[PDB]
Symmetry: C6
Subunit: 104 residues, 6 copies
């Protein structure tokens, strides 16, 4: 199981900015997003632990540069258990398959 990165911000523009910076800075795959409530949005990414780390730094940076956006919470999980991958929306799907193949 490749690493998972998760970042949450207030407002959609901030999560859009994080999304674009993350996938450009590291060899990662964006696997989904969550409308968390209270105008907060979560972005979930997958890839090698070091690539997720690089992406996360660029994501935080993009959010800081985005007007009205703030990073509320983030985490990187190096080797997520299969039970976690199954229950939480962090698994790969066929939609993001071309981006998974390109990342690895």
């Amino acid at each position: 199981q490749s690493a998972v990165g998760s970042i949450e911000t207030i407002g959609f523009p901030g999560i859009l900015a994080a999304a674009d910076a993350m996938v450009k800075a590291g060899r990662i795959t964006i696997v989904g997003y969550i409308r968390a409530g209270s105008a907060r949005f979560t972005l979930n990414i997958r890839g090698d632990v070091q690539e997720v780390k690089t992406a996360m730094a660029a994501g935080i940076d993009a959010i800081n540069r985005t007007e009205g956006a703030d990073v509320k919470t983030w985490v990187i999980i190096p080797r997520p258990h299969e039970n976690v991958v199954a229950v939480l929306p962090i698994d790969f799907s066929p939609e993001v398959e071309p981006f998974r193949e390109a990342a690895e």
Copy 2:
């Protein structure tokens, strides 16, 4: 990939005002809107980077002029990655196709 603009405000009237000003001021396509929670609404637009910039300025202006509405957060992403376009609701749809053709 043409640029993406994203703007978020408190209240629907403000997002309606932004929508109408943006599409009239620049050669852009409104691709969707998000009900973000907490009475916040997101509008997403696509087009040439300079047209999105012109639209964004007019959108911010329309929101400022709208009673009880405030721009909470906004961003412009010049060349959004395909993985971002696929996962986030910023892609073109057939509904907005006549407006895409007119913009370009």
Copy 3:
């Protein structure tokens, strides 16, 4: 494209009061309402710009008279672009067609 009026209040009773006052005061058509989150509700109306203006004043007045209700935000857009009408829930539907014919 006939004008669009949009009004948002805290609480459903206030939006009910606005709805009834607006359609009685001007020859307008109520096209929909939005559950905006945080107990806020949006009402969207269509009609001639002057009729929408008359309706909006009566709506604001009805909300002010309604216990526990306050107008949070409102706007009137005289000639909404087709792209806006398509993406945002402000278009006419067959349900409100008898009221459209009666208004014009």
Copy 4:
């Protein structure tokens, strides 16, 4: 068109208490409820204007007596326009038909 009464409170127990008091105190029909967001709940009722008035007073009273519940907002509309009845969830349905017949 018979009158419409609308009451909103914080918390579900309060709306349950209002519901039961209203239908017992007046010859009214409960037509629906709304989960308004932020733990607020709306109850909508229909009937003769005087019966709705009697029910509303009993509803407010029940909410006041309910632990942790407060009436946030309420309204009575004597003769709701058909456009309002169609768009907003205040119309009769077959589910509440036996209670409509009993009320009148």
Copy 5:
């Protein structure tokens, strides 16, 4: 119509604790739960008025003992009208039928 008890707390763990205490302390049936918004959860129960009273006391107690949980609002309605039972999610379903038979 047997009595209805309704309790609301902040957070799901608190409603889980209330659920388990209520059904163990009294001869009642849990009929459903509501995700009320703002991280608030409602639990609805049915049974004899005295059994609902006993359950409610145990539920409040369980919530008080639960870390980070507080009872926000609660009510007991002895003989809920049929119109209330039909419109609000407080009626018995086949899923909870074995627990209804065991309670009575």
Copy 6:
């Protein structure tokens, strides 16, 4: 009926961190998660009471170590009643069946 553990935090990254720590620290099964509103997320786990206790401690610890995340509320129920298991989303599903077999 095996024990149930429930933990709630602000933000998705915190619930992801709790998920991975819990399943690795104890022989437990993650049965589901809840989008609770207000950017709060609930995680529900099942297993032997002592395993759930070990997992819960590791979960709390993971949340404390996660940037911007805080444990809002948690509970452990040793022997949940069948009525609770049926109504609330805490039961096993075929998706988590391989993890149930591995835990026991």
